Write a protein that binds this ligand. Structure first.
Ligand SMILES: CCCCN1C(=O)C(=C/C=C/C=C2/Oc3ccccc3N2CCCS(=O)(=O)O)C(=O)N(CCCC)C1=S
Ligand SMILES: [Cl-]
Ligand SMILES: [Cl-]
Length: 129
């Protein structure tokens, strides 16, 4: 599913992501924009063999199991496929664990490089929330 800007902001808020760990909704939406362009089915193979899945491109080396990432962990206790679903519940719950891991949203390289320090509020502007 390809979410719309405000549509995703609403789903994210509905799942308690807004202001989670101090990160405003704009930040999450911005990260989703540059990680998957809002496509829940987005995947990206990394040079190390791991793979990024979903709206927030959660990686398999630590967070989900895809059975093809030697020596990896599955800290979110979910098959990586669950991160590709129309329903973002799994992705949101896993993102919550990730952002609480110590480095905040910096865990999402694209967020640091393209959202961090920017006018992220712009990402939910005009949205009926
Ligand atoms: C009627 C359909 C097209 C209208 N519509 C929009 O208005 C949407 C437009 C998004 C707004 C553009 C935008 O890109 C940004 C980049 C950085 C910061 C904010 C951004 N915003 C707008 C708010 C801030 S600003 O006004 O561009 O400065 C949109 O994403 N989408 C996707 C939502 C699909 C449900 C749609 S549908
Ligand atoms: Cl594996
Ligand atoms: Cl933080």
């Amino acid at each position: 599913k390809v979410f719309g800007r405000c549509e995703l902001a609403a789903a994210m808020k509905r799942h308690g992501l807004d202001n989670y760990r101090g990160y405003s909704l704009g930040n999450w939406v911005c990260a989703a924009k540059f990680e998957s362009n809002f496509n829940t089915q987005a995947t990206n193979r990394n040079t190390d063999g791991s793979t990024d899945y979903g709206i927030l491109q959660i990686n398999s080396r630590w967070w989900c199991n895809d059975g093809r990432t030697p020596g990896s962990r599955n800290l979110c206790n979910i098959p990586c496929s669950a991160l590709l679903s129309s329903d973002i519940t799994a992705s949101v719950n896993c993102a919550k664990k990730i952002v609480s891991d110590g480095n905040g949203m910096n865990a999402w390289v694209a967020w640091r490089n393209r959202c961090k320090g920017t006018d992220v509020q712009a990402w939910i502007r005009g949205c009926r929330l």
